[PDB]
Amino acid sequence: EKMGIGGLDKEFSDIFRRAFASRVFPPEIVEQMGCKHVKGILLYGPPGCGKTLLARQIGKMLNAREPKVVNGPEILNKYVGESEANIRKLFADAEEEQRRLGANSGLHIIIFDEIDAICKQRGSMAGSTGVHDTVVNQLLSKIDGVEQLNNILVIGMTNRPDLIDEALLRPGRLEVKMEIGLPDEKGRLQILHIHTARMRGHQLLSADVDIKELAVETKNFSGAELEGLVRAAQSTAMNRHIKASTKVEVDMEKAESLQVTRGDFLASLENDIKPAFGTNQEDYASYIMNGIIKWGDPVTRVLDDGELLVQQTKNSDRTPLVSVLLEGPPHSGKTALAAKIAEESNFPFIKICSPDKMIGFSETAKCQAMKKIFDDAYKSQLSCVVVDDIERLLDYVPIGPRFSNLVLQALLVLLKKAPPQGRKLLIIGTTSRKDVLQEMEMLNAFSTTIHVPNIATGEQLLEALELLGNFKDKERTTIAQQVKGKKVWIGIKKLLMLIEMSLQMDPEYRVRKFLALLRE
Amino acid sequence: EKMGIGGLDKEFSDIFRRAFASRVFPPEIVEQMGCKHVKGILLYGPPGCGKTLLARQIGKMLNAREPKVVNGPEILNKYVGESEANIRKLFADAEEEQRRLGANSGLHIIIFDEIDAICKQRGSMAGSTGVHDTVVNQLLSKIDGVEQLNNILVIGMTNRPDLIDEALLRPGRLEVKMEIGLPDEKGRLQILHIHTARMRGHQLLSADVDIKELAVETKNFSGAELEGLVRAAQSTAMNRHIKASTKVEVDMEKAESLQVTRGDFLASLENDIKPAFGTNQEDYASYIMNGIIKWGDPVTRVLDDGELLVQQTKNSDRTPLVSVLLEGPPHSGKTALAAKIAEESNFPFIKICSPDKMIGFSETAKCQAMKKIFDDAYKSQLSCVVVDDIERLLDYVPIGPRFSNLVLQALLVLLKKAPPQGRKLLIIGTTSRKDVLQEMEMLNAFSTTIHVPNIATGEQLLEALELLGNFKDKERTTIAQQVKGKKVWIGIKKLLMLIEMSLQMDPEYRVRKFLALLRE
Amino acid sequence: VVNGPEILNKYVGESEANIRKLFADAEEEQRRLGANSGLHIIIFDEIDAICKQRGSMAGSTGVHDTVVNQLLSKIDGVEQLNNILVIGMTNRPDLIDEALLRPGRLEVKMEIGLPDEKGRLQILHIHTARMRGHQLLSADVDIKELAVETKNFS
Ligand SMILES: Nc1ncnc2c1ncn2[C@@H]1O[C@H](COP(=O)(O)OP(=O)(O)OP(=O)(O)O)[C@@H](O)[C@H]1O
Ligand SMILES: Nc1ncnc2c1ncn2[C@@H]1O[C@H](COP(=O)(O)OP(=O)(O)OP(=O)(O)O)[C@@H](O)[C@H]1O
Ligand SMILES: Nc1ncnc2c1ncn2[C@@H]1O[C@H](COP(=O)(O)OP(=O)(O)OP(=O)(O)O)[C@@H](O)[C@H]1O
Ligand SMILES: Nc1ncnc2c1ncn2[C@@H]1O[C@H](COP(=O)(O)OP(=O)(O)OP(=O)(O)O)[C@@H](O)[C@H]1O
């Protein structure tokens, strides 16, 4: 339509309505029904969603010919007297054109590129005691008394929503707050196409660049983050050409200037991996280090009961909140199977609330960083949160026994706190202690419990060793002469610890080392 | 008398007692018998509450005939000395009538627009030394020393009640409390009829539009949002007059002028959602999530004994404080039926002291969020407070057992502390652990307990399933023919867990899976 | 007259300077004539809030450890060797500092108890003497009779 803004179909049409459609188009109801038009728009959002790119381009749709972009703290850099002077010379050229020509253009655009630098009045009623609050209210006195019944438009944008005072967020001052969030899958295919427009019209690069395949593999990150995939991608194609021949500098147009491949993109999201946030992108290989093998027949019967219950989250309307529990012996593979079921849902918000990121926190800050994860799962539609390793969030120890009662009573409630209306949430829990959770009345809160047992037979013990591929078939036959006819019971995380302790010995001594360690 | 304004019907005597009631009758014995005057009224309220149309009338209460308006920020643009002389443009306006005639109604009230801008008083003196507070030390002299024989009333008005000056709280200065609430039903529809008369189109708008059709859906917010409600709707007319016609590039008068349809206000409360406020009931549907089916006689036993007790709260003399406790097994509908008894009571103040809004709070913050609820129940005449899930407020866990004593003592008092005379308070409690609340000496404090049991028979089980409507009669016969003459004992919330998990399965194995679930 | 809790309302720095401000206005009146007025009266409206010293060492990491100073060693050492008079008053009189009740500093008590019914008669005669300058308003309002149904208050 214009210089590209993608994934804001429901939002660029929203600022069509409130400011753009009135005061210019019809104009008969404007001149019949004497109207007050809106004064400007406040732009919420995480960094990287084109808040500037609207205001860089909203002064470039009707070609109003007067854009006025001021910077954030650009006013304040004078001393007293002249501090107030810049905003009353900023509105002045549009206030002067409120003339005997009172209507009819009508100088529109006034842009504060980050307005919370000036307009705080945050509620703690402080901060230099008002060199800014003499240009906060001087800004407010310029729009009401004297009235600007005009075409002016004060588009100020920000990142912190609440810290601008609501006396400036009243409808006479500024009403239209607009949450400009990170785009979805449909939003990201709109926005890969813009930066890959000129390269699409460059040489038909390699035809394996599928922006639908790049929409799904890039699942979280926003617009400016998504441009940074491209600026590394076409830069990767340069050092495909400018350093393979010579060093700094020599080579210049030696290979008939080359093409952006799919192999450049997949290396461009190995570097950079980081979406920033990192919501749904933890790179959970730290939680699943050695894959998910089907060592036992119950293993499929664990992770199907996940997706037999994931469909309850996707489809239902009776039960909007699902709280499952993956229990069992320790080292049995509960955290690993919790990440796989959380991955196979393909939800748009998959967060692993896990105590490996919460160490050293006091009894209180574990409640806040569990509140924060269970806030950002309410701000979606489908979301799975793995409340991992219950007896570490509860920081339990069986001497006494002691545990944080502040966290437990912030965790018995979040298993029953439903999300807002129409929204869904899946809670996967892992514990090695069912009987401890039976005392604290948490099995009452969890909906159903999935048992993850250890290995049960020697036939499961051989099959657990088959798929890993660490012993020879004659060595497995020696184990089959041993572990068949015996009772074995050991976890799978421990069973990876045993094999790596056994492979460090001499080849005549590895099997007898493994039989000693398995004996416990 | 009054200009169509109400809400504070107990306050319309207060102006006719102390402040406005004096300075008329002798007026030359006021100095012979030293009745000290009052110099000002201070007005509280939210942003957009509307005070000026009352402030021009509060001088017309006295027939003042010179209410002049000084603004908050507009006096604060000029420098020091000049600003203190421009307040002497409007205080020596009333001091020239402090003439050799020292009586007979010297010149009248000066209107403020914003004491939030003028009076701040942090105690800061770091950067323009608080130039906002440098006009008031001259302006506190203009009311006292040198005092006035005028009948002025300094009408202080703010949108934030914190930064009214605590050094101005002197009985000779402005000293009396005056909260002004939201506009009521008649106050909102008349000002809707003010705006729709000028924005008429034909009469008010196009058809299917009425100010009471809006009053039955817009009953929440303040006045400035209500001007922005129509201002969004005449912009939703620009959704209709031009955007429902075609795109940006609309023609000249071919839509037949196509003004506001129904809704254009339903959308204005949903895209975007504009309550901004604060404070109304939210949400008795968030706790009654799947409705209240009536699976037999124990559902009836809850509702009749509740409302006979609601008749006790409304129509008593001996019992100003009625405290009832609901009980039973967990997952048995205790939270919902307490909300059902309160919502049918039609009391004005029905708020829910709930644990799921207090997660992560300390022991002190659970006692000040509970007093803040019970203080606002001491202000209305009839009020029912649902105090849900006592043992999560008491953050109880039966290991040790550890519970916050400080909440228990902020709760054992409030089940015995009556409100002041004429105002009644109903308190409903829910608990899963009945006898634990007995051991804390709290069934001592409740007046009565109304039992909420589980479902008992298959006839009551199927009645809970006939009202939900989820199964085929051949399956419902099979569900009947298994538990026919057998005993089942499970909660109703758990019944929603088992049935919804059974819906996800394949119909060859749905009922047999449900028959394995109902076994426990 | 300076208020009690008004002297503390700042951060660190000004609540030690305000207790010098109300003496430097007296110290600058110690002019070339060292005696002879001698700017006398300093009213603490509540000295209890300054020399609080409750033991819990709270209150802005011990601001009540740092605002006793210009009450202690500004009147004494170096002395304003005058006839000045720091007239303090309080409502929680036991928890004032022991270093303040020294014969160089504020040294002697004044127990103003709540008044007797003779003393309540004397104060009612004062604020009805202006009522007597109206018309006396009843010809039977007797302040001795009104002093019967006030037994305790001030
Ligand atoms: N939705 C988008 N579509 C295309 N490009 C974008 C988009 N969002 C950001 N960009 C890129 O990012 C740059 C500006 O980003 P953006 O406006 O999001 O930063 P910002 O939000 O103004 O920063 P801040 O949050 O500090 O205000 C543009 O030059 C553009 O190349
Ligand atoms: N089929 C499998 N099922 C489960 N885990 C597996 C499987 N195959 C490999 N693993 C390994 O299990 C490891 C993680 O196990 P997990 O972290 O659940 O143990 P845990 O029960 O959390 O330990 P603890 O009881 O000490 O908390 C992963 O590193 C993964 O490599
Ligand atoms: N429930 C109510 N109780 C008392 N007064 C009410 C109520 N509802 C409305 N009012 C009156 O409505 C008026 C609001 O009028 P309006 O919004 O048109 O202008 P305003 O906001 O007062 O003016 P300004 O914008 O200058 O403050 C108030 O002054 C108030 O007196
Ligand atoms: N007859 C009924 N009475 C009350 N609630 C019912 C009934 N039938 C179904 N329900 C449903 O049961 C659901 C759970 O109700 P509720 O939260 O009151 O259970 P609860 O026993 O109080 O749980 P908890 O004790 O853990 O708070 C509600 O969504 C409600 O719609």
Radius of gyration of chain A (Å): 31 Å
Number of helices of chain A: 22
Distance between the termini of chain A: 70 Å
**Quaternary state of the chains:** part of a larger assembly
* Major sheet characteristics of chain A: 5 strands, parallel
Question: Structural class of the helices, strands and pairings of chain A?
Answer: alpha/beta
Largest interface: A-B, 78 and 78 residues
Strand content of chain A: 5-15%
Modified residues (Phosphoserine) (chains A, B): 354
Subcellular location (chains A, B): Cytoplasm
GO molecular function, one term (chains A, B): protein kinase binding
Family (chains A, B): Belongs to the AAA ATPase family.
Task: Please provide a written account of the structure.
Chain C: Belongs to the AAA ATPase family. Chain C: Homohexamer. Interacts with GABARAP and GABARAPL2. Interacts with GRIA2. Interacts with PLK2, leading to disrupt the interaction with GRIA2. Interacts with MUSK; may regulate MUSK endocytosis and activity. Interacts with CDK16. Chain C: This is Vesicle-fusing ATPase. This is part of a larger assembly, with three copies of chain A. With 520 residues, chain A is an alpha/beta fold. Chain A contains 22 helices and ten strands. In chain A, the strands form two sheets. A five-stranded parallel β-sheet of chain A has the order 2-3-4-1-5, covered by helices on one side. A five-stranded parallel β-sheet of chain A has the order 7-8-9-6-10, with helices on one face. Chains in contact: A-B, B-C. The complex binds adenosine-5'-triphosphate (ATP) (4 copies). The site of one adenosine-5'-triphosphate has 20 residues of chain A, from helix 14 and helix 21. The site of one adenosine-5'-triphosphate has 18 residues of chain A, from helix 4, helix 9 and helix 11.
